[PDB]
Amino acid sequence: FGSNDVTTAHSDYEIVLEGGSSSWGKVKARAKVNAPPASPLLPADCDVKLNVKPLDPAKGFVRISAVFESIVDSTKNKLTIEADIANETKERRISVGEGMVSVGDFSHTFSFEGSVVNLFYYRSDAVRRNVPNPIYMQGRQFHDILMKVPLDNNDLIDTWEGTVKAIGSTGAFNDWIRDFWFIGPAFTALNEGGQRISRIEVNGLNTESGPKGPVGVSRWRFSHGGSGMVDSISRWAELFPSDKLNRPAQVEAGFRSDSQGIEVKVDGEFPGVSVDAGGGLRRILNHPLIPLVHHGMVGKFNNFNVDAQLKVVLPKGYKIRYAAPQYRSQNLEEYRWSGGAYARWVEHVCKGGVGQFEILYAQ
């Protein structure tokens, strides 16, 4: 079989759904890969907790929260972000948030009031009329951020002074900043993910006094165009299911990468899992392609064999007609995919594949 030196990747996935018109879903995903990660700082572990609650249902000011704890080469890192997000218009979105990023001993707290405008390059009705499941939707995003950071430590003050010097001394700051904040292979992910980031435009960054001392206030906009591969652009309404959020949604993920492999645990309960295709049929939502390609960036490094078992737990009286690749088992409401075509598809998408998994299920 070409080569005999193949490692093993054991994976279990679980998509429990809710009945009715609800798009809610409990998604669990455990994995264990006996393959070396691609982290130059290898003993990298992370624990992510993203919990979103609804506030002001009329205004949609849903408060999302994110806690990324991590330990990379014995370096302890943490990033907390709270943000009231709101779907102002079908194109606009407004967020007011705070946060705190800590690394080892260093730490700083920030706030922001950012507006994102996701403009599609076309809204023609021909494509919608004929194509039933549009995926590659060409578009562009405009972020306008108003970040603020109390300059407490000398690290913050020195960084602010350096940036103030740079923005006025070098006219190519708007270009090379992209090289900066796409650190490492992230820059590659721009070209191989179909996303082009335009030069930033600083409306003005200027320090001002705050309640905890000086506050560096940076007001800058930037742009982010997606050829269609970008799930954050092509699927924008489906990205933010605020109208479908009544119960708190929680996603606790984590990995434990090391020199010998990657352990992954994900638990989640969130909307947007089920999408009405039309005619009463529903789908497990289209797979975002950016995760697939960005992982295939670190997927084609070792030859591996996958033991992947997907378990779809549909509601009480919902059939699963036309689920290609087909399942292996079935308990009259609990369908299992394992081996055969599904394992090939898992190896396909674990290595950068963006193929389809159309789990169309009835009512």
Partner 1 sequence: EPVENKNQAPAPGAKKHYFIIENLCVGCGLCLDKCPPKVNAIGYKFYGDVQEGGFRCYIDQAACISCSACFSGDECPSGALIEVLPDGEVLDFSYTPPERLDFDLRFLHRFHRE
Partner 2 sequence: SGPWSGNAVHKAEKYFITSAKRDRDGKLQIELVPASGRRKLSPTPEMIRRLIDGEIEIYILTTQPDIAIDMNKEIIDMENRYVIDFDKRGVKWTMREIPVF
Partner 3 sequence: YQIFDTEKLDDEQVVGGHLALLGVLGFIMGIYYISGIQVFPWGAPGFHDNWFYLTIKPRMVSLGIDTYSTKTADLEAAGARLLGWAAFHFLVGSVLIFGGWRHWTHNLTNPFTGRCGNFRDFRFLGKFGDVVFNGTSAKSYKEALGPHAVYMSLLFLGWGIVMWAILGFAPIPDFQTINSETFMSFVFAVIFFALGIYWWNNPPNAAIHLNDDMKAAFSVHLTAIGYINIALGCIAFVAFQQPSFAPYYKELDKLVFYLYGEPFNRVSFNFVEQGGKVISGAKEFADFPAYAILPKSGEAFGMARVVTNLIVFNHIICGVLYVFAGVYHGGQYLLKIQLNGMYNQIKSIWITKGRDQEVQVKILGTVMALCFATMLSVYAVIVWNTICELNIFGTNITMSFYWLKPLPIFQWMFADPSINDWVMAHVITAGSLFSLIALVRIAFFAHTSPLWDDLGLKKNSYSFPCLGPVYGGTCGVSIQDQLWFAMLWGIKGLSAVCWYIDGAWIASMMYGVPAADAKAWDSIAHLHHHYTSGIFYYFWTETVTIFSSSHLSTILMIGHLVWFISFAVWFEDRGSRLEGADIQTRTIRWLGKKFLNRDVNFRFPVLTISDSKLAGTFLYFGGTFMLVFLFLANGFYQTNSPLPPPV
Residues of this chain that interact with ligand BCL (CB under 6 A) are 27, 29, 48, 50, 52, 62, 64, 66, 81, 83, 85, 93-95, 97, 112, 114-116, 122, 124, 126-127, 130, 143, 145, 181, 224, 231-232, 235, 238-242, 245, 249-251, 253, 266, 268, 270-273, 285, 288
21 lines the binding site for partner 3 (CB under 8 A): no
Residues in the chain: 363
Sheet holding 323-324, edge to edge: 274-278, 281-284, 358-361, 323-324
Whether 310 and 27 have beta carbons less than 8 Å apart is answered as no
To the question of whether residue 295 is assigned a binding role by annotation, the answer is yes
Closer of 106 and 301 to partner 2 (Cβ): 106
Q: How many residues bind partner 2 (CB under 8 A)?
A: 10
To the question of whether residue 143 is assigned a binding role by annotation, the answer is yes
Q: What are 114's two structure tokens?
A: 């950012």
DSSP 16: E
Q: How many CB atoms lie within 10 A of CB 130?
A: 8
Q: Which of the residues 112 through 151 are near partner 3 (CB under 8 A)?
A: none
The region of 6-14, 21-29, 123-131, 290-298 touching partner 3 under the rule CB under 8 A is 6-14
Question: How near is the Cβ of 318 to ligand BCL at its closest, in Å?
Answer: 18
Question: How near is the Cβ of 248 to partner 2 at its closest, in Å?
Answer: 26
Question: How near is the Cβ of 344 to ligand BCL at its closest, in Å?
Answer: 21
Partner whose footprint covers residue 30, from partner 3, partner 1, ligand BCL, none (CB < 5 to 8 Å by kind): partner 1
- Whole-angstrom CA distances from 43 to 68, 77, 186, 214, 322 are 16, 13, 19, 37, 43
Q: Please tell me the number of Cα atoms within 13 Å of 18 on its side-chain side.
A: 14
Partner whose footprint covers residue 273, from partner 1, ligand BCL, partner 2, none (CB < 5 to 8 Å by kind): ligand BCL
Q: Which of the residues 64 through 93 are near partner 3 (CB under 8 A)?
A: none
Radius of gyration of the chain (CA): 22
Three-state SS letters, 185-250: CHHHHHHHCCEEECCCEEEEEEEEEECCEEEEEEEEEEEEEECCCCHHHHCCCCCCCCCCCCCCEE
Partner whose footprint covers residue 254, from partner 2, partner 3, partner 1, none (CB < 5 to 8 Å by kind): partner 1
The two beta strands, 281-284 and 358-361, are antiparallel
Partner whose footprint covers residue 13, from ligand BCL, partner 1, partner 2, none (CB < 5 to 8 Å by kind): partner 1
End-to-end CA distance of the chain: 43
Q: Which of the residues 327 through 356 are near partner 3 (CB under 8 A)?
A: none
Handedness of CA 177, 179, 184, 185 (dihedral sign): positive
Question: How near is the Cβ of 102 to partner 2 at its closest, in Å?
Answer: 5
Q: What are 247's two structure tokens?
A: 């119960």
Point out which residues bind partner 1 (CB under 8 A). 10, 12-14, 28, 30, 32, 43, 45-47, 69-71, 73-74, 76, 254, 256, 258, 263-265, 307, 309, 311, 336
Partner whose footprint covers residue 239, from ligand BCL, partner 1, partner 3, none (CB < 5 to 8 Å by kind): ligand BCL
Per DSSP, the residues of 247-300 read S-EEEEEEEE--SS-EEEEEEEEES-SEEEEETTEEEEPPPPHHHHHHHHTTTT
Question: How near is the Cβ of 265 to partner 2 at its closest, in Å?
Answer: 14
Closer of 7 and 203 to partner 3 (Cβ): 7
Binding residues: 108, 143, 287, 294-295
Please give the residue ranges that form the binding site for partner 2 (CB under 8 A).
Answer: 74-75, 102, 104-107, 152-154
